């Protein structure tokens, strides 16, 4: 299986520096081109740089030349992007991809992407509050419950239910940016009304930028 | 329409 | 690895820039090691950042 | 640089329809054009390369063609899982450049939302803020109006909405609206109500609670 | 300024698709007519009925 895995994305101040890695497996980067491509609200999908690790030839987008450098270590089957003099407009998901692998003249494998946030704001971990099921969240014999993940920065935060075992009926809403500059989101799940009180429901929240991991049990309220 | 991080989808 | 006299010169200029912090200084030095073909471009961006932080 | 112009920006069609989306290069790119799919929360996935060749594992209902500098991606029988954004990309000249994308949505029958409301939690109330959440579950189409009322006074400027992307199996949407108040303001009023207008409802639906009720 | 031209695509068999074209009014107009002409190759001669001063189009294909 061909795989590319980016790492190193995170919050960085304007003018600061960050280094991304792209670990390849299932093929040798000596046989392909390796590209970095980013994706942002402002510019969409935007090619950043490429390298041919066999001969070290590199090319760069005009908007990053001099500030970013691409490189590869064939002995670790890994490519890198050094990012200096960072600007707000560099905020993006950074993907690495291969081109020419198996003779296919397109980017046929892309990593999951790593988010880079260029901002002067500080990291903040979220508060996790239950959205308890009640007489106001049930109808037709099913009930909705959830978790409110409030006031964090930067993205990303992840939410699962019952350690990933509960996936059916889950809606994890897209994050919203509050006027405070902090993000918030809710995750809800619909379940049988008859399971409330017998089946445990826990939302597993992870905000890696703050090393915040919260497992919150959600149950009906007392009275 | 522009790209949105939390969905990775174009948004109007 | 080793370097030619032009590459050594670019390292020396970035090493001496007074208005970079150490994260920026070493990030630019890392870029010089990463891609020697970009030495002139990397030096120019380092100069611009140094000037803007005067 | 070469510009890639995609059209339409949005296309909405029923399951089983044939859909066509287009991409124009600002100058000759020969056949060096690929098409990518991006599903919700995913990375771009290669569908077509060299204008017309199907990438391994991609369903046969995807096809591509070229006419001069005009490129087409066709899905012959739209499936619910084809709900995604689609991007063309030229690799003829450096920099490789991407189109701005076409969003493909699934048309389906109207479905009214299930409407639910959640008071602020006692945990949150221990702090100084109150979040009230209105939930609209599994509806279609996407258009919906949610209004908040506190002691019957229409609220404005103190709520935010978030909407899921189309569900991969049933093609519905869900929406949350969150009303944010100070704890002091929340404890000053009694009746919290979310009113929902949607094409599937014969008239607007209000879901509410009195602060303090179990 | 940026506008959205909304289009109903009405095929000979009664199937209906909808589309949006964004840009200036002149750009979006040109892209809509260009897209109609393209679909006409497969779906038959098109006719385009303009509503709302040009900001909405009903485009029917003859088959």
Q: What is the CATH number of the domain that holds E18?
A: 3.10.20.10
Q: How many Å lie between the alpha carbon of A82 and the closest alpha carbon of chain D?
A: 19
Q: How many distinct structural domains can be found in chain E? A: 1
Q: With an 8 Å Cβ cutoff, are A45 and D98 in contact?
A: yes
What would you report as the CA-atom Rg of chain D, rounded to the nearest whole angstrom? 23
Q: In chain D, which residues touch E (CB < 8 A)? A: 5, 7-14, 17, 19-20, 22, 70, 72, 107
Are the C-beta atoms of A68 and A49 separated by less than 8 Å?
yes
Q: Which pair of structure tokens corresponds to residue D47? A: 């569908």
Residues making up chain B, counted from first to last:
12
Are the C-beta atoms of E7 and E19 separated by less than 8 Å?
yes
What's the rounded Cα separation, in Å, for the pair A139 and A133? 11
Method by which the model was determined: X-ray
* 3-class SS of residue E1: coil
Q: Which pair of structure tokens corresponds to residue A154? A: 């930067």
Q: With an 8 Å Cβ cutoff, are B10 and D41 in contact?
A: no
Contacts of B4 in chain A (CB under 8 A): 41, 174
DSSP A11-55: EE-TT--EEEEEEEESS-GGGSEEEEEEEETTTEEEEEEEEETTT
Tell me whether chains A and B touch (3+ CB pairs under 8 A). yes
Q: Which residues face E9 on adjacent strands? A: E17, E59
Are the C-beta atoms of A32 and A24 separated by less than 8 Å?
no
What's the rounded Cα separation, in Å, for the pair A7 and A82? 12
Out of E31, E32, E39, closest to residue D20 by CB: E39
Quick count: other Cβ atoms within 10 Å of Cβ D126? 9
- List residues in chain C that are followed by a break over 2.5 Å (C to N): none
Asked if the C-beta of A119 comes within 8 angstroms of chain B's C-beta atoms, the answer is no
CATH: 3.40.190.10, 2.60.40.10, 3.90.550.10, 1.10.10.10. Which one for D1-108?
Answer: 2.60.40.10
Task: State how far Cα A46 lies from the chain centre.
Answer: 18
What's the rounded Cα separation, in Å, for the pair A166 and A172? 12
Contacts of D85 in chain B (CB under 8 A): 9-10
DSSP C1-54: ----HHHHHHHHHHHH-TT--HHHHHHHHHHHHH-GGGHHHHHHHHHHHHHHT-
Task: Find the domain containing E29 and state its range.
Answer: 1-63
What's the rounded Cα separation, in Å, for the pair A137 and A24? 46
Are the C-beta atoms of D84 and D37 separated by less than 8 Å?
yes
Among candidates C7, C17, C4, D44, which has minimal Cα distance to A84? C17
Among candidates A61, D37, A143, which has minimal Cα distance to B10? D37
Q: How many distinct structural domains can be found in chain C? A: 1
Q: With an 8 Å Cβ cutoff, are B2 and A42 in contact?
A: yes
Q: Where in chain A is the domain with CATH 2.60.40.10?
A: 121-220
Out of D10, D17, D22, closest to residue E20 by CB: D10
What's the rounded Cα separation, in Å, for the pair D49 and A104? 8
Q: Which pair of structure tokens corresponds to residue A220? A: 């009906």
* 3-class SS of residue A95: strand
Q: How many Å lie between the alpha carbon of A110 and the closest alpha carbon of chain B?
A: 14
What's the rounded Cα separation, in Å, for the pair A100 and A33? 6
List CB contacts of A35: < 8 A, sequence separation 6 or more.
Answer: A47, A48, A49, A50, A96, A97, A98, A99, A107, D96
Among candidates A67, A71, A97, which has minimal Cα distance to A83? A67
Are the C-beta atoms of A83 and C28 separated by less than 8 Å?
no
Q: Is D67 left (phi over 0), alpha (psi -120 to 50) or beta?
A: beta
Q: Which pair of structure tokens corresponds to residue D174? A: 């869900």
The single residue listed with the structure tokens 């101040």 is A13
What's the rounded Cα separation, in Å, for the pair A206 and A216? 11
CA angle, residues A52, B8, D87, in degrees to nearest 5: 60
Q: Which pair of structure tokens corresponds to residue D27? A: 């100058």
What's the rounded Cα separation, in Å, for the pair A180 and D112? 33
Q: Where in chain D is the domain with CATH 2.60.40.10?
A: 1-108, 109-211
Q: Is D61 left (phi over 0), alpha (psi -120 to 50) or beta?
A: alpha
Helices (H), E1-63: 25-43
Q: Read off φ and ψ for residue A17, nearest 5 degrees.
A: -130, 150
Supply the CATH classification number for the domain A121-220: 2.60.40.10
CATH topology of domain D109-211: Immunoglobulin-like (2.60.40)
Task: Find the domain containing C1 and state its range.
Answer: 1-54
Residue A113, classified by CB atoms within 10 Å of its CB into exposed (0-12), middle (13-18) or buried (19+), is buried
Q: How many Å lie between the alpha carbon of E21 and the closest alpha carbon of chain D?
A: 5
What's the rounded Cα separation, in Å, for the pair A79 and A95? 11
What's the rounded Cα separation, in Å, for the pair C10 and C13? 5
């Amino acid at each position: 299986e061909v795989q590319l895995v980016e790492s190193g994305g995170g919050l960085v101040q304007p003018g600061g520096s960050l280094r991304l890695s792209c670990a390849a497996s299932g093929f040798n980067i000596k046989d392909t081109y390796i590209h970095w491509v980013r994706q942002s609200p402002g510019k969409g999908l935007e090619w950043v740089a490429r390298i041919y690790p066999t001969n070290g030839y590199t090319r760069y987008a005009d908007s990053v030349k001099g500030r970013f450098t691409i490189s590869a270590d064939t002995s670790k089957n890994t490519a890198y992007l050094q990012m200096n003099s960072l600007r707000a407009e560099d905020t993006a998901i950074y993907y690495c991809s291969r081109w020419g692998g198996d003779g296919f003249y397109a980017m046929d494998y892309w990593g999951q992407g790593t988010l880079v946030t260029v901002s002067s704001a500080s990291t903040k971990g979220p508060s996790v509050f239950p959205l308890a099921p009640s007489s106001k969240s049930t109808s037709g014999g099913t009930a909705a419950l959830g978790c409110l993940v409030k006031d964090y920065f930067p993205e990303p935060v992840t939410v699962s239910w019952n350690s990933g075992a509960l996936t059916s009926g889950v809606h994890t809403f897209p994050c919203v940016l509050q006027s405070s500059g902090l993000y918030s989101l809710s995750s809800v799940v619909t379940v049988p009304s008859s399971s409330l009180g017998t089946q445990t429901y826990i939302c597993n929240v992870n905000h890696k930028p703050s090393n915040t991991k919260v497992d919150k049990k959600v149950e009906p309220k007392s009275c | 329409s522009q790209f949105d991080f939390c969905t990775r989808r174009l948004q109007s | 690895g080793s370097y030619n006299k032009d590459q050594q010169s670019a390292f020396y200029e970035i090493l001496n820039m007074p208005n970079l912090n150490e994260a920026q200084r070493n990030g630019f030095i890392q870029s010089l090691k990463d891609d020697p073909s970009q030495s002139t471009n990397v030096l120019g961006e380092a100069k611009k950042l140094n000037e803007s932080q005067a | 640089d070469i510009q890639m112009t995609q059209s339409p920006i949005l296309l909405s069609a029923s399951v089983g329809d044939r859909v066509t989306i287009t991409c124009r290069a600002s100058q000759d790119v020969n056949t060096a054009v690929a098409w990518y799919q991006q599903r919700t929360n995913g990375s771009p996935r290669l569908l077509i390369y060299s204008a017309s060749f199907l990438y391994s594992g991609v369903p046969s209902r995807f096809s591509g063609s070229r006419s001069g500098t005009d490129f087409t991606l066709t899905i012959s029988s739209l499936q619910p899982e084809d709900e995604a954004d689609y991007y063309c990309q030229q690799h003829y000249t450096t920099p490789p450049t991407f189109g701005a994308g076409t969003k493909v949505e699934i048309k389906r029958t109207v479905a009214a939302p299930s409407v639910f409301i959640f008071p602020p939690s006692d945990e949150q109330l221990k702090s100084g803020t109150a979040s009230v959440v209105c939930l609209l579950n599994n509806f279609y189409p996407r258009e919906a109006k949610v209004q908040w009322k506190v002691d019957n006074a229409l609220q404005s400027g103190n709520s935010q909405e978030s909407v899921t992307e189309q569900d991969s199996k049933d093609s519905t949407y869900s929406l949350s609206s969150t009303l944010t108040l100070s704890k002091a303001d929340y404890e000053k009023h009694k009746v919290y109500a979310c009113e929902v207008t949607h094409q599937g409802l014969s008239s607007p639906v209000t879901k509410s609670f009195n602060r303090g009720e179990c | 300024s940026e506008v959205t031209i909304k289009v109903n695509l009405i095929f000979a068999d009664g199937k209906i698709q909808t589309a949006e074209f964004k840009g200036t009014f002149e750009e979006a107009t040109a892209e809509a007519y260009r897209y109609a002409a393209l679909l006409a190759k497969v779906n038959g001669e098109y006719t385009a009925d303009l509503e709302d001063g040009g900001n909405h189009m009903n485009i029917k294909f003859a088959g």
